[PDB]
């Protein structure tokens, strides 16, 4: 009692600590990597566990073409993704690479199996390289959602976003002096 605790102190913050998903595979993986980090203190494992706790809206997908373009100076390393890897038909040919992901499309899996690559699961990554030796951690673009592009106030002079519905008039939509 009788103490001042609101003068140089801010309110607490809330962060995720558990995956939140019913899928038992993700719970198992999160717990295993948390144990590994507890017993080694490595940064790769810490970031991996944090990523495994993220929500689906914060885990964008990654294409094979983007993966190829990102492995230009490091073809011998292992690409690690905490999301699904999809196919890119726009790319006629793909090189040989090693990728570890949560999921693969059937087409992406088959394309990687051809060309001599290897598709890896997080279970095998834990079995072989628990601390991520010779591994690169990658993610997609978090601002690519269509919902993200409509945040803000369309009618203000300094915003650069569009209104949400369909608008047919002219008042305030044809320059700074349309009002």
């Amino acid at each position: 009692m009788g103490i001042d605790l609101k003068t140089g102190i801010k309110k607490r913050k809330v962060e995720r600590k558990e995956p939140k998903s019913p899928n038992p595979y993700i719970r198992l993986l999160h717990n295993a990597f948390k144990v590994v980090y507890e017993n080694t203190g490595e940064d790769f494992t810490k970031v991996l566990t944090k990523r495994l706790c993220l929500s689906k809206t914060n885990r964008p997908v990654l294409s094979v073409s983007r993966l190829a373009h990102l492995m230009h100076k490091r073809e011998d390393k292992i690409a690690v993704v905490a999301s699904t890897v999809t196919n890119d038909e726009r790319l006629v040919t793909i090189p040989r690479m090693t990728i570890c992901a949560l999921k693969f499309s059937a087409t992406a899996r088959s394309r990687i199996e051809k060309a001599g690559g290897r598709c890896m699961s997080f279970d095998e990554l834990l079995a072989e390289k628990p601390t991520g030796d010779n591994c690169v951690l990658l993610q997609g673009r978090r601002s690519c959602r269509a919902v993200c592009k409509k945040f803000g106030s369309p009618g203000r002079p300094n915003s650069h976003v569009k209104p949400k519905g369909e608008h047919k008039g002219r008042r305030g939509a044809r320059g700074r002096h349309s009002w």
């Binding site: 019913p22 899928n23 279970d123 834990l126 601390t131």
Partner: protein, 313 residues
């Protein structure tokens, strides 16, 4: 991965390989979700009458007569309001409520496959209510040919060592508690084994055994694989049903069975291996914490702080 086949008297006679549907991952959450949706799709609608409570003539008296302002009938009886005797509901129930639910085809297929895979686990079959101490193998496959007399069906049931589960149900019939016993749901019995056949006549023999249910192999029902939403149910397969199930899934056009994954037991094996152990590094010893005591109380406590013993007190 082989499966033993038994004859009508309980002796092995043949052998079959394990169909790939039995390698699907076990997902209780998906089975629960699909069970809930499908079971809500079977209800019949109900609602009150649209004319209930509004067939009388009632109007409010105003203020100035020393009575509350609700509507009244000619003699002065209150009417219409939901807090008046005889009035209408505040929000009467209607039949335009959404009674059904939608489930994608892929998730329905996933749920049925996962329940089938659970049915071949033995541990799950025991965790669910089933007396399978005397059962030879799981899956249980029997070559029964055609059975049209209940006596022969009972003979087979005793031969394959599954009679205790039929007697479990035969002795459990009783009258249900509460309302419902007057709504055509008077009696309740426990759940027994499930028979899956194909191009064979076993229905007439098996129909009248309490607790037993029948299914054709080309149209398996999920509400029967997971009664009460609990997945592990004991199944008796005929030989033809097993052989055909081998490829009933190949007739689902452009469908791929979901990929197998690791389980809990397979994880600590990985975590206890040397390859993962080589990376472990011990953490320093923790801080030492003791209760605060007055050093001047005793000379030992004082010596803990000033070894020289030069402090007068």
């Amino acid at each position: 991965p082989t499966v033993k086949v038994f004859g009508p008297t309980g002796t092995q006679v043949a052998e079959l390989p394990r169909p790939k549907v039995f390698n699907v991952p076990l997902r209780p959450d998906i089975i629960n979700f699909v069970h809930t949706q499908l079971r809500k799709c079977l209800r019949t609608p109900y609602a009150v009458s649209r004319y209930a409570g509004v067939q009388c003539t009632a109007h409010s008296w105003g203020p100035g007569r020393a009575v509350a302002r609700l509507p009244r009938k000619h003699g002065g009886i209150g009417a219409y309001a939901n807090f008046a005797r005889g009035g209408h509901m505040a929000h009467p129930t209607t039949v335009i409520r959404r009674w059904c639910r939608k489930v994608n085809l892929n998730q329905r297929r996933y749920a049925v496959a996962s329940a089938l895979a659970a049915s071949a686990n033995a541990a799950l079959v025991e965790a669910r209510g089933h007396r399978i101490a005397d059962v030879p193998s799981i899956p249980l496959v029997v070559d029964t040919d055609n059975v049209t007399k209940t006596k022969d069906a009972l003979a087979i049931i005793k031969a394959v060592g599954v009679l205790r589960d039929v007697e479990r149900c035969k002795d459990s019939r009783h009258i249900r508690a509460g309302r419902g016993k007057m709504r055509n749901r008077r009696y309740i019995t426990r759940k027994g084994p499930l028979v899956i056949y194909n191009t064979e006549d076993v229905a007439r023999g098996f129909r009248n055994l309490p607790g037993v249910d029948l299914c054709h192999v080309s149209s398996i029902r999920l509400l029967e694989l997971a009664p009460g939403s609990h997945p592990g149910r004991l199944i008796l397969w005929t030989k033809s049903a097993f052989a055909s199930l081998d490829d009933v899934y190949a007739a689902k056009q452009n469908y791929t069975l979901p990929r197998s994954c690791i389980t809990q037991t397979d994880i600590e094996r990985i975590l206890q291996s040397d390859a993962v152990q080589k990376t472990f590094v011990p953490k320093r010893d923790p801080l030492v914490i003791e209760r605060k005591v007055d050093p001047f109380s005793s000379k030992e406590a004082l010596a803990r702080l000033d070894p020289s013993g030069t402090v007068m007190p």
